[PDB]
Amino acid sequence: GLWDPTLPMIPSANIPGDPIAVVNQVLGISATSAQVTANMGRKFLEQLGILQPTDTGITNAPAGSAQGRIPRVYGRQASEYVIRRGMSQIGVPYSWGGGNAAGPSKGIDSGAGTVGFDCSGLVLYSFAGVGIKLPHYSGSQYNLGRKIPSSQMRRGDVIFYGPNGSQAVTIYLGNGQMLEAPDVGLKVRVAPVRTAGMTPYVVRYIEY
User: Fold this and answer.
1) What is the DSSP string of 134-199?
2) What angle do CA 59, 73, 89 make, to 5 degrees?
3) Residue 43's closest CA among 56, 31, 30, 62?
4) Coil, strand, or helix at residue 125?
5) Most buried residue among 9, 84, 134, 147 by CB atoms closer than 10 A?
6) Which of 134, 198, 188, 191 is closest to 166 using CA atoms?
7) CA distances (Å), 40 to each of 6, 122, 185, in order?
C-alpha cells in the first residue's frame, strides 16, 4: 500500500540541477529550464502590472511559507494558467525522464529516444509558466511548496505518490480528477484520483 500499484513501483526519474531546455543550432543559442522559467515569470508579473526591477521572475515561496511572490488576489489566475498549460499537453506521449520548462523533451535511460513527459516533467513544465521553478524529480518537488492535508486537496494542488513522494506526481483538477503523465505507451491524460500510495499531504505552490 506504499506505492500506486498501477504504475512501476520505483522512484520516478531524477534529473539533476538545471538542465538545458532549449537548443537552437541555427541561432547558436541554448538556455536552461531556470532561464526559461524566469523569463515566463517576468512576463507573468508584467501581465499582472506588478513587475519590479528586483524580480528575477522566479516566484516560489520559501518552502513551508504561506507567502510567495505572486499576490493572493492573483493566485487563481496563476493557478488557472498553470492548469491550462498542463491541459494543453493532453495527448503528448509519456517518456521516462521527459520534459523541461520549455515543453516535452527526450527522456533518460529507457526514455532516451522518446520525446514526451514523465510525471515530474509535466508538473514542472506546467508551473514554469508563472515562474514556479521545480526540480525534475517528484521526491524533490515534495520538499518544496506548502503542505496541505490530502483530504483537503484543492484544484491546482499537486498530488504525490510513494515513499517521500518519490513514485509519481500529478496535478489535482478538482472534482476527483487529476492530470498525469502516467506510464510508457500512454499519453498525458485526465484520470480519476487514485488513493493507493498517495502521500498524506498534497503540495500547494500557488496561494489563493
Assistant:
1) --BSHHHHHTSSEEEEGGG--TT-EEEESGGG-SEEEEEEETTEEEE--STT-BSEEEE---TTB-
2) 60
3) 56
4) helix
5) 134
6) 198
7) 35, 16, 31
The Cα 183–Cα 192 span in angstroms is: 15
Residues 6+ apart with CB under 8 A from 171: 82, 83, 86, 122, 123, 126, 156, 157, 158, 159, 178, 179, 180
- Could you tell me the end-to-end alpha-carbon distance of the chain, in angstroms, rounded to an integer? 32
Separation between Cα atoms, residue 22 and residue 77, nearest integer Å: 27
The SS3 call for residue 86 is helix
**Radius of gyration for the chain, computed over Cα atoms and rounded to the nearest angstrom:** 16
Cell readout for 89 is: 499537453
- Method used for this model? X-ray
119 and 168 Cβ atoms separated by less than 8 Å: yes
Q: Looking at the domain covering 1-208, what would its CATH class be?
A: alpha beta
In terms of phi and psi (left: phi > 0; alpha: psi -120 to 50; beta: otherwise), the region of 25 is alpha
* Joined grid coordinates for residue 12: 520516478
Domain ranges in the chain?
1-208
- Show the CA angle centred on residue 82, arms to residues 171 and 130, nearest 5°: 130
